[PDB]
Ligand binder design. Structure first.
Ligand SMILES: Cc1cc2nc3c(=O)[nH]c(=O)nc-3n(C[C@H](O)[C@H](O)[C@H](O)COP(=O)(O)O)c2cc1C
Length: 109
């Protein structure tokens, strides 16, 4: 299988904080749950992250749509990796967005 990590963000809170992350997410990024849970995942961004790709995710989240972007991200120790990020909205039967799920793939290669 393709190596990847997975997270769940709560779309019922205004800033889409993370409520769950797979073990690989913590291992890959170097952050622990104490530093991650309850926070928006944007802490992974840094100097070289392309604001235009970030904008795409921001837009997809506001519209409740899925989106896939390639983003420069940084580990806790400050080292970079290329992240192919797919975000999927999870909707309740009334059509409202409850959760976003994110799949990260380290495509640094
Ligand atoms: C489920 C989910 C997973 C996300 N995963 C990442 C990620 O791995 N790396 C990243 O830079 N941003 C990720 N984001 C994007 C940020 O959390 C945030 O939505 C993005 O930076 C746009 O918002 P902002 O303009 O307010 O920062 C994720 C967002 C969601 C909802």
């Amino acid at each position: 299988g393709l190596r990847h990590t997975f997270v769940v963000a709560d779309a019922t809170l205004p800033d889409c904080p993370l409520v769950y992350a797979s073990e690989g997410f913590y291992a890959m990024t170097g952050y622990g749950p104490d530093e991650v849970l309850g926070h928006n995942c944007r802490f992974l961004q840094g100097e070289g992250t392309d604001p235009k790709e970030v904008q795409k995710i921001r837009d997809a989240i506001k519209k409740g749509e899925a989106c896939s972007v390639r983003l420069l991200n940084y580990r806790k120790d400050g080292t970079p990796f290329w992240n192919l990020l797919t975000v999927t909205p999870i909707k309740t039967p009334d059509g409202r967005v409850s959760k976003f799920v994110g799949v990260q793939v380290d495509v640094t290669s």
